[PDB]
Nucleic acid binder design. Structure first.
Lengths: 335, 306, 45, 45
RNA sequence: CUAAGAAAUUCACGGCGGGCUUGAUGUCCGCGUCUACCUGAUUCACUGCCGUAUAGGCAG
C-alpha cells in the first residue's frame, strides 16, 4: 500500500555559522582581518505613548496624565565606531551533501521509494536551479537583513576553502544582484556548480562568506535579537537584547539560514513579496500569513505524498520546492 | 573494555549550538553520551572503511559558553530561545525550550585495529578529520576552521611506546597540546563512598541526596563552607530500563523496524572536571559504552580511570 | 494612576515605578498578560 | 583592644590594624554604622 | 547512528530639572646585605683593484 513513514526527519543541509560583525573603513577591506568587532552596548530610551488607545484611554485627562509618565527602557544597541563606515559580516557555510537521504525513516519501502524519487529528480535535473538561488542569496547580501537597506555599496566575498587554504575566490556587487530576480552570471553559475557538487557529493563543501556594507560613520547596525521569555520579575530589565558571541555582535545562524532559504518564488499567491523562505505551509513570520496552505494542493506534505506514494509528480517548480524543503530539513510524521 | 592501540587527537573543535540541556536534572555541558555516540557514528562512517575501531572518547572543552541570560532580580538563569516558524494559520507555535551552547572541545578518541599498519597515521587522522567536519556533536554543527591563522591539525599518538620514557614524553607532548581545556571524567566511586559516609551520618539516605550534597555549596556552623575535592558536577550516566525490551517490528512509531526498542530513563552519576595533566595516563580518561542489555543499565563511564 | 501600561503594537508591559516618575519595562505580552497582571497585582498602584 | 573606633564629631570609622600598632580609616558613618560593623565583624579583635 | 532529526524576536522611543560634604590632627624609635666571577663565541662577510659588466677574477 506504501503508507507514509511515521518518523521522517531530514538533517539541515546548507548549515551556516553565526555571522560575526566587525567594523572598519571602506577601501581597506582587503586588510580586514584585524578589524575591531562591533560591540553590543546599553543605552537608555525614554518614549511617550505612541500605540493605539483602546477607546477607554482616550479621555484627554487620562491622556495628559499618561504622557506625564514616560516609559523607560535600557535597550541594547550596536553602532559602528565614529570613524568607521563599513560593516564586515563574516560567516562560514557548510554545504553538506546527501540531500535526499533522511536522517530517520520508518518504512524501508517508503525509504527506497523516496531515494528513487530523489535520484529521479537529480538525474533528471540536478541541484542547478536550487543552488543557483542559494548562490544568489549568498551573492546579494540578503543575510545582511536590516544592514542592507540603506547601504551605499554592498560587496560580498565568497571563498571556497579546501583542506587549509582558499581554493577559489569570488567577489560580487551585492546591490546590482537584486533581491527578487534570479538571473544568470558566470561567477554566480560557478558558485552554483560548487553548491551543486556540495549537495550531490558525500563530503562537505565549505564556503567563507564575507560581506561589507558602507553604512556611514557611527551608524546603527542590527545584529540578531534574542528571544528570552521571563524577562524578569518586580524590577527593571532589558526590553531588547542583542546577540553577541564573544563580546562581538553577531547574527544568529538560523537567521542567516532563513536568508539563504529565501528562494521560494513558486507559491501560488502573487509575488507581491517576491521570494519567501522554504517552509512546509510556507509561512512568512513578518507577514503573519501562511502561504502554501493545505487547502490548496501546494504545501510540502501533500506534494511529497503525491510525488512519492502515488507517483503524481508535480510541476518542476513545485518539485524544486519539495527538494528545497528536503535540503532545509524538518521533522515530519503522523501519530 | 579493551585498551587502545593508539590515541588519536581531534583538535579544538568548535560546536556552535550544542544541547545545553544534558538531562532532566542537569544543564550545562552536554551529556558524555553525545560524545560516545559521536565516536560510534565516526566508527560507523569511516571505521568500517579504514579497518580500525574508534572507541572511547576524551573530552577536554577548551572553552564553553551557554546561550543563557540571568533575568533581573533572580539568582537563576533562563535560556535564549529561537523563533520557530508559525503554524498554517499564522499563530505563534507553542515554544519548546531548547538550550544552546557554544563549545570548543577536543576529542581524545582511542583507536585500535589492523588499519594502523595498512595506512599512515596522518592519513587516517586526516580521514577522520575530514569526516568529522561534516558531522554534529550534540545537536550542534561542527565549525570547520576556515581562513583563520592556521588549521589545527591532528596527531595520532601511537600508544605503544618504545620505552616508558618515550611513552611519557609524547604523552606530555600531547598533554601540552590539549592543555587549555579541562578533562571530564566519571567519578562514581567517590559518589558511592560519599553515600556511605552520608548514610553513616543519617541512615536511609539515597545517593540522589549524596549527589545533591556534592553539588550544593552547603554551609557549616562553627561559618565555613564545605570544601569540595575538585570540580564536582552531576552528569547523566546513561539510561535505565523502564520497559521490557520490545521486538523490532512491535512498538508503534519507532525510528526503524529492525532495532529492538525499550523505554528508558536517565541515570545521574557524578563527574569531575580536572586539568588533563593530573591523570598521568591519557590511555585512561576515555568514555566507553557499557550496556548489559538483559538488565537494562545502558550506561557510559570512564573505566580504568583510577 | 495606573500600575501597568501595555504598549499595544509592540507587545510590552510597562509597570509604573514610583521612585522616578515613569514607567519601566516589566515583561512582554499583550492584553491577556496585562489583564492577568492586573488580576494578580491590582491596578491603580 | 577594640576593633573599631568611631571618631564621633567627624563621622569616620577607624578600624584597628595589627601590622602597625594603630587605627586606620575604614569608612564614614557614625554610631549606627559602628554598631552595625560591630554586629558584623565582632569587636575586641 | 549523538534527549537524534527542525526553527527570523521585531517594529518605534527626549531621562533632566536642582544642589556648600565639612571642621580637627606628632607616624616613630632601631638596623653590617655580603661573598666570587674570561663577554668572547673566527662575531669587523671589510677596503679597494682588473673587467663594459651586476659575468668572472684579483690584492691585503
Amino acid at each position: 500500500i506504501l503508507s507514509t513513514a511515521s518518523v521522517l526527519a531530514f538533517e539541515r543541509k546548507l548549515d551556516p555559522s553565526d555571522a560575526l560583525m566587525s567594523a572598519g573603513a571602506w577601501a581597506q577591506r582587503d586588510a580586514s582581518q584585524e578589524w575591531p568587532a562591533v560591540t553590543v552596548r546599553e543605552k537608555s530610551v525614554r518614549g511617550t505613548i505612541s500605540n493605539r488607545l483602546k477607546t477607554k484611554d482616550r479621555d484627554p485627562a487620562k491622556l495628559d496624565a499618561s504622557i506625564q509618565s514616560p516609559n523607560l527602557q535600557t535597550v541594547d544597541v550596536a553602532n559602528l565606531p565614529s570613524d568607521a563606515d563599513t560593516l564586515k559580516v563574516r560567516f562560514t557555510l557548510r554545504v553538506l551533501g546527501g540531500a535526499g537521504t533522511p536522517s530517520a525513516c520508518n518504512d524501508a519501502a517508503y525509504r527506497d521509494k523516496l531515494l528513487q524519487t530523489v535520484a529521479t529528480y537529480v538525474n533528471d535535473q540536478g541541484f542547478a536551479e536550487l543552488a543557483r538561488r542559494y548562490a544568489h542569496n549568498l551573492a546579494n547580501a540578503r543575510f545582511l537583513w536590516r544592514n542592507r537597506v540603506g547601504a551605499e555599496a554592498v560587496e560580498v566575498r565568497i571563498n571556497h576553502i579546501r583542506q587549509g587554504e582558499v581554493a577559489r575566490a569570488w567577489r560580487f556587487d551585492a546591490l546590482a544582484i537584486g533581491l527578487r530576480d534570479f538571473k544568470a552570471d558566470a561567477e554566480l553559475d560557478a558558485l552554483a556548480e560548487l553548491i551543486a557538487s556540495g549537495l550531490s557529493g558525500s563530503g562537505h563543501v565549505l564556503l567563507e562568506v564575507v560581506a561589507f556594507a558602507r553604512i556611514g560613520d557611527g551608524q546603527e547596525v542590527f545584529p540578531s535579537q534574542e528571544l528570552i521569555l521571563d524577562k524578569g520579575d518586580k524590577k527593571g530589565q532589558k526590553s531588547k537584547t542583542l546577540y553577541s558571541v564573544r563580546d562581538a555582535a553577531a547574527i544568529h545562524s538560523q537567521k542567516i539560514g532563513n536568508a539563504l532559504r529565501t528562494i521560494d518564488t513558486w507559491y501560488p499567491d502573487e509575488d507581491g513579496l517576491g521570494p519567501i523562505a522554504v517552509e512546509p505551509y510556507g509561512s512568512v513570520t513578518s507577514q503573519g500569513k501562511a502561504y502554501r496552505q493545505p487547502k490548496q494542493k501546494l504545501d510540502f506534505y501533500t506534494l511529497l505524498d503525491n510525488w512519492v506514494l502515488r507517483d503524481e509528480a508535480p510541476a518542476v517548480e513545485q518539485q524544486h520546492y519539495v527538494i528545497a524543503n528536503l535540503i532545509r530539513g524538518g521533522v515530519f510524521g503522523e501519530a | 573494555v579493551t585498551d587502545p592501540e593508539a590515541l588519536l587527537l581531534l583538535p579544538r573543535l568548535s560546536i556552535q549550538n550544542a544541547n545545553a540541556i544534558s538531562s532532566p536534572l542537569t544543564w550545562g555541558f552536554p551529556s558524555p553520551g553525545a560524545f560516545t555516540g559521536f565516536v560510534h557514528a565516526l566508527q560507523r562512517r569511516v571505521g568500517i572503511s579504514l579497518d580500525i575501531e574508534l572507541d572511547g572518547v576524551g573530552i577536554v572543552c577548551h572553552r564553553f559558553e551557554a546561550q543563557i541570560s540571568q533575568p533581573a532580580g533572580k539568582r537563576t538563569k533562563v535560556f535564549n530561545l529561537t523563533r520557530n516558524p508559525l503554524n498554517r494559520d499564522g499563530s505563534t507555535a507553542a515554544i519548546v525550550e531548547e538550550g544552546r551552547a557554544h563549545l570548543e572541545v577536543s576529542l581524545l578518541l582511542g583507536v585500535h585495529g589492523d588499519g594502523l599498519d595498512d595506512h599512515p597515521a596522518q592519513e587516517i587522522a586526516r580521514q577522520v578529520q575530514e569526516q568529522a567536519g561534516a558531522m554534529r556533536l550534540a545537536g550542534g554543527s561542527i565549525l570547520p576552521w576556515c581562513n583563520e591563522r592556521f588549521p589545527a591539525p591532528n596527531a595520532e599518538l601511537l600508544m605503544l611506546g618504545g620505552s616508558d620514557e618515550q611513552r611519557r614524553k609524547n604523552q606530555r607532548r600531547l598533554t601540552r597540546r590539549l592543555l587549555p581545556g579541562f578533562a571530564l571524567v566519571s567519578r562514581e566511586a567517590l559518589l558511592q563512598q560519599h553515600l556511605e559516609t552520608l548514610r553513616t551520618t543519617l541512615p536511609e539516605a539515597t545517593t540522589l541526596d549524596a549527589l545533591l550534597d556534592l553539588c550544593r555549596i552547603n554551609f557549616e556552623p562553627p561559618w565555613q563552607v564545605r570544601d569540595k575535592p575538585g570540580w564536582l558536577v552531576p552528569i547523566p550516566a546513561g539510561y535505565n530500563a523502564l520497559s521490557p525490551l520490545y521486538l523490532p517490528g512491535e512498538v508503534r512509531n519507532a525510528r526503524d523496524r529492525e532495532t529492538p526498542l525499550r523505554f528508558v530513563e536517565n541515570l545521574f552519576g557524578l563527574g569531575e572536571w580536572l586539568s588533563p595533566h593530573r591523570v598521568a595516563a591519557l590511555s585512561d580518561l576515555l568514555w566507553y559504552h557499557h550496556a548489559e542489555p538483559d538488565k537494562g543499565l545502558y550506561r557510559w563511564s570512564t573505566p580504568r580511570f583510577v | 494612576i495606573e500600575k501597568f501600561r501595555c504598549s499595544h503594537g509592540y507587545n510590552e508591559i510597562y509597570k509604573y515605578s514610583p521612585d522616578h516618575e515613569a514607567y519601566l519595562f516589566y515583561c512582554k505580552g499583550g492584553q491577556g498578560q496585562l489583564n492577568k497582571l492586573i488580576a494578580e497585582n491590582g491596578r491603580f498602584m
